[PDB]
Design an enzyme around this catalytic site. Structure first.
Site, PDB file in Angstrom:
ATOM      1  N   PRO B   1     -40.081  57.090 -69.366  1.00 45.55           N
ATOM      2  CA  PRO B   1     -40.677  58.335 -68.874  1.00 45.55           C
ATOM      3  C   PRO B   1     -42.193  58.322 -69.007  1.00 45.55           C
ATOM      4  O   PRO B   1     -42.726  57.753 -69.959  1.00 45.55           O
ATOM      5  CB  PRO B   1     -40.078  59.393 -69.802  1.00 45.55           C
ATOM      6  N   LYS B  32     -34.980  58.397 -75.411  1.00 41.16           N
ATOM      7  CA  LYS B  32     -35.356  57.008 -75.171  1.00 41.16           C
ATOM      8  C   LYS B  32     -36.380  56.537 -76.200  1.00 41.16           C
ATOM      9  O   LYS B  32     -37.251  57.304 -76.607  1.00 41.16           O
ATOM     10  CB  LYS B  32     -35.918  56.842 -73.756  1.00 41.16           C
ATOM     11  N   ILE B  64     -36.729  58.667 -64.579  1.00 40.74           N
ATOM     12  CA  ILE B  64     -35.655  58.203 -63.710  1.00 40.74           C
ATOM     13  C   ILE B  64     -34.359  58.939 -64.024  1.00 40.74           C
ATOM     14  O   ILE B  64     -33.891  58.931 -65.162  1.00 40.74           O
ATOM     15  CB  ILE B  64     -35.415  56.689 -63.871  1.00 40.74           C
ATOM     16  N   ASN B  95     -44.574  70.628 -65.059  1.00 41.92           N
ATOM     17  CA  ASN B  95     -43.705  70.352 -63.920  1.00 41.92           C
ATOM     18  C   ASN B  95     -42.877  69.099 -64.179  1.00 41.92           C
ATOM     19  O   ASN B  95     -43.320  68.196 -64.884  1.00 41.92           O
ATOM     20  CB  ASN B  95     -44.527  70.198 -62.639  1.00 41.92           C
TER      21      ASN B  95
END
Ligand SMILES: [Cl-]
Ligand SMILES: [Cl-]
Ligand SMILES: [Cl-]
EC number: 5.3.2.1
Lengths: 114, 112, 114
Positions: B1, B32, B64, B95
């Site tokens: 990320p 993660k 993802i 966002n």
């Protein structure tokens, strides 16, 4: 196309002529004139990969349609070394991302007005 | 990320250790390991909204692979952002974007 | 609406009250109250554009609604002169692109969670 470089490397460390060099390299790989190539290098960023603030660069390449896929690999093979060596960044800490631009999105030149 | 923070707060007043802290928080939120986390803070911006140039932060998380998830992420990150950057919570926005697998980030270690 | 200005003009060269002026011009241009206008100026970038590193500004307006040519034209008429004059950039080196915001892309305010 448009090539953007975000990096934590200080502004003063970016060598002179580096922008022209990037432009010439992209123009070389694409056979496209330097006239319609844009390049953004944004230094002095606060960045970390895995919590590590060592020299790094997140890059993005934006081109019309899709001159990528395998040409992504090609672009990587063309730009990675230049970025790593000019910016004094370890190759494993340089990332390049590839995007498809919308060709129908019209940029407006302000000389038509003003 | 990948987490990006755009703020008009001067780079000097971004607390030492904030990047690591953000990284760990994102590690908890996403589940993660930190190695897969990239944090990008962009200080010294000229920003205004709500009719004000007071300290603010527009942020984005790209990963993802849901509204509930976004809500929990916000709950986890907002306090840290607001407190560390000394920004009023109502001037911090986040966002959330699902990253297209085509294409992700290409590492240069393989190439030259 | 969200207006982003990417420029190689130094941060110190951006005049006092420029964000306020831009906010007023954008509110007049979009017909929305000034409080709803967001402005993000990103200065001090290393930008080569058209093979030149002379002062430039690449701008984008993101607003909810269908992208129309006439509307984009009027936007440009309203914004170009302000940008060029205030930032001291040649009008032919100021570009504006217009983007349709995804209404289903929700921005989360942190006052709810902090
Ligand atoms: Cl840190
Ligand atoms: Cl709910
Ligand atoms: Cl008109």
């Amino acid at each position: 196309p448009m090539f953007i470089v975000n990096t934590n490397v200080p502004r003063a460390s970016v060598p002179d002529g580096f922008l022209s060099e990037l432009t010439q390299q992209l123009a070389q790989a694409t056979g496209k004139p330097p006239q319609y190539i844009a390049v953004h290098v944004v230094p002095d960023q606060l960045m970390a990969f895995g919590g590590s603030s060592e020299p790094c660069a997140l890059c993005s390449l934006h081109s019309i349609g899709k001159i990528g896929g395998a040409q992504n690999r090609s672009y990587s093979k063309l730009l990675c070394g230049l970025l790593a060596e000019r910016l004094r960044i370890s190759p494993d800490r340089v990332y390049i991302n590839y995007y498809d631009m919308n060709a129908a999105n019209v940029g407006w030149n302000c000389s038509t007005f003003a």
